[PDB]
Amino acid sequence: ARVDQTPQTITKETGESLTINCVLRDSNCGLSSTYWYRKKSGSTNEESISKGGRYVETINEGSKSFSLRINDLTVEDSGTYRCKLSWWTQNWRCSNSDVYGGGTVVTVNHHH
Amino acid sequence: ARVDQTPQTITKETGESLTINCVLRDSNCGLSSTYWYRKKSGSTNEESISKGGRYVETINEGSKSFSLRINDLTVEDSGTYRCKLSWWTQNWRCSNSDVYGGGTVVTVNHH
Amino acid sequence: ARVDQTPQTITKETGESLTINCVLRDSNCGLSSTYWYRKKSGSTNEESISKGGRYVETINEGSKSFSLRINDLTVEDSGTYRCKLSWWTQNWRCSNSDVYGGGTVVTVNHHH
Amino acid sequence: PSDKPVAHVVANPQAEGQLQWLNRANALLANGVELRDNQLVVPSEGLYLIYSQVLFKGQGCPSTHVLLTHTISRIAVSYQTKVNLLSAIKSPCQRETPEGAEAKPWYEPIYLGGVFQLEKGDRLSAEINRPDYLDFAESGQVYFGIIAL
Amino acid sequence: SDKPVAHVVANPQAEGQLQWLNRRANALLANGVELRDNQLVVPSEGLYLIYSQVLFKGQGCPSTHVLLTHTISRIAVSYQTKVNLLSAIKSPCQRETPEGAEAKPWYEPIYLGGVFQLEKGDRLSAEINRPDYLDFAESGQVYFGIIAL
Amino acid sequence: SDKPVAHVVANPQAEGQLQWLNRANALLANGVELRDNQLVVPSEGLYLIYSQVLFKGQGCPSTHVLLTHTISRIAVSYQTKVNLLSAIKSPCQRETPEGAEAKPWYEPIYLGGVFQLEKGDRLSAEINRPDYLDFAESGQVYFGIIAL
Ligand code: NI
Ligand code: NI
Ligand code: NI
Ligand code: NI
């Protein structure tokens, strides 16, 4: 089992958008529960990324891939993003451990 | 086949409230999904009005009428408001096309 | 026939957390609908506490107890908090009237 | 084969948003039972197992209230009174789907079944209240049957 | 017909309690089946179809978790032992209703049915766990029946 | 009794799999057989066929969960599988946010109907989501037929 999170680094400017993608590899399990977390620049605490508004999550179950798009980026969106997979809702769990993507360091700058 | 949205123009001052009404005419369909949208003055994009808090939607299914009241108005509430009807949740859709009200130009001033 | 709300006073600082506990005593009813209300310091109106995020409610039906934990306190969290029990969702109601806890006066301060 | 009055009709897949019963393969209508006026007609007095299933489906939750009912009723041969024999109600939508969200379809089957004394000439009806959410796109999902015991 | 048979319905007169009645029209209790201590009594050994439906209703969703169960159980004629024949669980409330919103009631039926070999004198019970959400205000919604096949 | 009859229940010892079991308060008599997880019809006639399954989850996942239960008929000779009875349920409208108290959901599915079957017919009762199957309690998961 391995979760391939790409790209590993993203540099954008304010008002643009970005996409991070995670794919579950080498597993007989399908996607179950997916989550996204962000540790902002300078902060040392992870917050859950709630889907909606500027944040749009897409899921492709057949390819076991899911993505996070952030529209109208701001400088505060700079930080480290990481996906997490869990099977905790199942009555007969496919996997007893969660698995995480490798992370993406996101840098958002101004236009000048 | 036509949504009569009234009034077409509203002018208020800060702290007052307003009401917009939409009624579905000339249709064998009843109300299903109802929406309210706002394009603020100067803006070129419509945003959905989330029902709740300052925004109160009331629905009379028998008369196919529904209305939006906005309480404690601010200057930022100025813009063009429009109601929208859809039947997209039904398995056997009553109408394949949505229908929109004619719109209301809302102006909120100080004093 | 009585809700014991404890503690009666709480004094915390910014960023800390607190817990208020309510227990339904002397009743042939179990817990049904639970609510939390807050009247801020200086304010004269009670507001509903939306459960979730910063506010964590735990319910123990077996002991007829439920508690509210508030994390990352701010000075604006200062006020009087009160729990409320209701049975209005039931088709055959155990009780026709609601019952309230005695209240907790919460003070949140800044650091030195 | 068997000589017991028996029926098992299914929804017509060509109907447009309407529950119309048809007599197809793996369906039954023999030994006196008839299908008339979208109703099953009982050929003789006796004990009958009566059963039915309907399936409702929606793409989301609308602003107006959606209460789904399925009812089997009896029209007496003599007095032409309609009395509910079996009925059930389901409520799939607590909150309207927020705007801009992706369609997340819901499904709501209702199954009914019971044993009743019927008289010759009784007519049984199996009816729903919201045809706009009826789902009969796949076999085995919507059916209505009786068999004399 | 000479088959042992019953089809009892919930008493609309009871206060928050599931009490079965036979005396109704379109209800049955014949050929040896008896109703005693709110239980159906089997008159002879044989194969029986056993079925039941109950209906739950609430005015909203509460903060505590609501698990609705319906169980048909068998008590052997000789021993006071109750063993479950058929059972199901439903969870209608995923999210608590915010106060002050639209009273939007919910409904939850549970249907049970199967074939079992019973002995003379067996007692059958059909029971729920949440009488505070029981809804028997309309005919055809709550019933409990058996018939020897 | 002399009627062909069966009433099998889920094996509580199986690991996340719908496997049918024979006998107490279970039946399999007068010719009906249990073979390849399927009920085998011994003779032509009218049969009441029924089944119940129970699903359980600890919460709602990010993927959308459709629960199906289907009873199908496999002709002894023609190797055709046709659905006789089927139903679908959707327990989860929104994914459960992390960090809340576990609020499990339960979803039973009941199927029942009368069908004319032929000698040698095979009946199957199948689900699509074994990862949510719940057979931890008696009386909850069963599959039966009886000749009428
Ligand atoms: Ni800039
Ligand atoms: Ni630039
Ligand atoms: Ni002013
Ligand atoms: Ni401070």
Which pairs from C64-68 meet CB under 8 Å and 24+ separation?
Answer: C64/C23, C64/C24, C64/C25, C64/C27, C64/C30, C64/C31, C65/C21, C65/C22, C65/C23, C65/C24, C66/C21, C66/C22, C66/C31, C66/C34, C66/E63, C67/C19, C67/C20, C67/C21, C67/C22, C68/C19, C68/C20, C68/C36
| All domains in chain F, ordered by first residue | 2-148 (2.60.120.40)
Three-state SS at B76: helix
Q: What are phi and psi of A80, to 5 degrees?
A: -105, 125
**Nearest chain F Cα distance for residue E15, angstroms:** 28
Residue among B31, B59, B88 whose CB faces D59 most closely: B88
Amino acid, single-letter form, for residue D134: L
3-state SS track over E45-112: CEEEEEEEEEEEEECCCCCCCCCEEEEEEEECCCCCCEEEEEEEEECCCCCCCCCCCCCCCEEEEEEE
Q: Which two tokens stand for residue F93?
A: 């409208």
Residue among F91, F110, F138 whose CB faces E84 most closely: F138
- Mutation target to probe the E interface, by most E beta carbons within 10 A, among D87, D104, D129, D147 is D87
Contact call for residues B5 and B102 (beta carbons, < 8 A): yes
Report d(CA A16, CA A71) in Å as an integer.
6
Which pairs from F8-15 meet CB under 8 Å and 24+ separation?
Answer: F8/F34, F8/F39, F8/F142, F8/F143, F8/F144, F9/F138, F9/F141, F9/F142, F9/F143, F10/F53, F10/F133, F10/F135, F10/F140, F10/F141, F10/F142, F11/F135, F12/F135, F12/F136, F14/F135, F15/A92
- Tell me whether E5 touches chain D (CB under 8 Å): yes
| DSSP-assigned states of every residue in C16-85 | --EEEEEEEES-S----EEEEEEEETT----EE---BTTEEEEEETTTTEEEEEE-S--GGG-EEEEEEE
Q: Which of A21, A46, A18, A19 minimizes the C-alpha distance to A34?
A: A21
Other CB atoms closer than 10 Å to residue A42's CB: what's the count? 7
| DSSP-assigned states of every residue in A47-97 | EE---BTTEEEEEETTTTEEEEEE-S--GGG-EEEEEEEE-TT-SS-S-SS
Three-state SS at C107: strand
> What is the distance of C-alpha F141 from the center of its chain?
7
Interface B:C, ≥3 CB–CB pairs < 8 Å: no
Report d(CA D64, CA B32) in Å as an integer.
6
Three-state SS at C13: strand
Residue at token pair 């036509």:
B2
Other CB atoms closer than 10 Å to residue A22's CB: what's the count? 26
Using the beta-carbon criterion (under 8 Å), do D115 and E26 form an inter-chain contact? no
CA–centroid distance, residue A14 to ligand 2 (Å) = 9
Three-state SS at B77: helix
**In sequence order, what are the residues at sequence separation of 6 or more whose Cβ sits closer than 8 angstroms to the Cβ of residue C112?**
none
Three-state SS at E27: coil
> How many CA atoms within 13 Å lie on the side-chain side of F95?
19
Q: Cβ contacts (< 8 Å) between F97 and chain C: which residues? A: 52
CA–centroid distance, residue D95 to ligand 2 (Å) = 44
> What is the distance of C-alpha B52 from the center of its chain?
14
Report d(CA E125, CA E83) in Å as an integer.
10
Contact call for residues C10 and C104 (beta carbons, < 8 A): yes
Distances (CA, A) of C107 to A29, C10, C43, C78: 50, 6, 14, 5
- Tell me whether F30 touches chain E (CB under 8 Å): no
**Nearest chain F Cα distance for residue A42, angstroms:** 24
Residue at token pair 């007052």:
B16
Q: Is A90 exposed, middle or buried (0-12, 13-18, 19+ CB in 10 A)?
A: buried
Q: Which two tokens stand for residue D82?
A: 């309609």
Report d(CA F111, CA F132) in Å as an integer.
18
Three-state SS at B92: coil
Other CB atoms closer than 10 Å to residue C87's CB: what's the count? 21
**In sequence order, what are the residues at sequence separation of 6 or more whose Cβ sits closer than 8 angstroms to the Cβ of residue E41?**
E33, E34, E35, E121, E122, E123, E124
Query: In terms of residues, how long is chain D?
Result: 149
- Which structural technique was applied? X-ray
CA–centroid distance, residue A74 to ligand 2 (Å) = 14
Q: Which two tokens stand for residue C4?
A: 């014991």
Residue C69 forms beta bridges with which residues? C19, C56
Other CB atoms closer than 10 Å to residue D79's CB: what's the count? 8
Distances (CA, A) of B10 to B49, B70, B76, D80: 17, 12, 14, 57
- Closest chain E residue to C94, measured at CA: E132
Angle subtended at Cα F69 by Cα F66 and Cα F70, rounded to the nearest 5 degrees? 130
| All domains in chain C, ordered by first residue | 2-109 (2.60.40.10)
CA–centroid distance, residue A106 to ligand 2 (Å) = 18
Report d(CA B67, CA B49) in Å as an integer.
13
Give the dihedral of Cα atoms B48, B53, B54, B59; nearest 10 deg.
Answer: 70
- Tell me whether C35 touches chain E (CB under 8 Å): yes
Q: Which two tokens stand for residue E2?
A: 């000479």
Residue D74 forms beta bridges with which residues? D83, D124
Q: Which two tokens stand for residue D108?
A: 């709501």
Distances (CA, A) of B47 to B39, D99, E133: 6, 10, 41
Residue among F24, F103, F108 whose CB faces E88 most closely: F108
- Tell me whether A98 touches chain F (CB under 8 Å): no
3-state SS track over chain D: CCCCCEEEEEECCCCCCCCCEECCCCCEEECCCEEECCEEECCCCEEEEEEEEEEEEECCCCCCCCCEEEEEEEECCCCCCEEEEEEEEECCCCCCCCCCCCCCCEEEEEEEEEEEEECCCCEEEEEECCHHHECCCCCCCCEEEEEEC
Report d(CA D58, CA C105) in Å as an integer.
48
CA–centroid distance, residue B107 to ligand 3 (Å) = 14
Please report, in angstroms and rounded to a whole number, the separation of the first and last CA atoms in chain C. Answer: 44
Q: Cβ contacts (< 8 Å) between B59 and chain D: which residues? A: 63-64
Report d(CA F109, CA E52) in Å as an integer.
15
Q: What are phi and psi of C77, to 5 degrees?
A: -75, 0
3-state SS track over F77-104: CCCCEEEEEEEEECCCCCCCCCCCCCCC
Q: Which ligand is nearest to the CA of C109?
A: 4
**Nearest chain C Cα distance for residue F30, angstroms:** 47
Using the beta-carbon criterion (under 8 Å), do D90 and E105 form an inter-chain contact? no
